[PDB]
Amino acid sequence: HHHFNLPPGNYKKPKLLYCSNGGHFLRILPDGTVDGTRDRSDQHIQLQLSAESNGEVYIKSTETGQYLAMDTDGLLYGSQTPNEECLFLERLEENHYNTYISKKHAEKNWFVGLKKNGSCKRGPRTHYGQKAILFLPLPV
Template sequence: MLLQRLALLVAWVSQLYADAGAALSGDQSSRLRIKWQASIREARLSSNDKGVSPPHPITAGRTTQLLYCRIGIGYHLQILPNGTVGGVHEHTEYSWLKVFAMKQGVVGVQGLKSGLYLCMNRDGVSHGLSLFMADCLFRESLEENHYTTYSSFSYPGFYLALSPRGEARKGGSVSKLQPCTHFLPRSGVQ
């Protein structure tokens, strides 16, 4: 189990180094090395856990926040334990999210309470999964109006969006210009 986790981690880091190439300065390289070492430590510590999915690739650089969408009466994005993604007006324990960087401009999102990763499938349906995979990667973009949009990394042009009733909308039916795709990251006391 530990060897599988370490093999996945080494493959991911190798790919990250290949992508970064010579563009990394010494300081950036040092930070990446520290994150990689922290990931290995976490994999070793969790190797005794049975039935636990592997940790996401980067453990450092995570932020805990709410994602507020200004559509309708305003909703906080939430990931429920059954995998349902939607919005709720008053934030709940399922609204607190960990947003972590995978590479520049690409993030993953995990529900703090549910433990599920935010993903989008080829049909543009947002849902939560217990295992982190390519469908769980999003391009994070700061728009001119200072709101943030999240588009699927695997399916370009598909955006994370909520309806005026707080339901998840299909990613292919919206554009980044629509308010339903605009999120405001909010930090605060849980």
């Protein structure tokens, strides 16, 4: 129940998910915490995306093997194993950026998003039109 404009590019190589908002890269820490950092030398910002179905992806830390996931209350966390909370609908936005909508909570438009201060947005606080939800996958 969402548009199907997909971004180009593939999932062959890992990427850094750069957030246009504050300029932070999405980060999945060893303890399961998820946030953003501007430090390009960080070892937990390298992410491998994989397509599960057309337009659906898993976003995994290449350093720890953890899956990006959004919980029942909209909080991003790092999961040790893949589950329905780890699937995201990857879509093009503003004819340029990549956005990631929680498949599980797609009806409520809960996006992956980073605030200018580097902390993740909670699902319910995200919405189309915010810069917090706009990402650019950059080469590692």
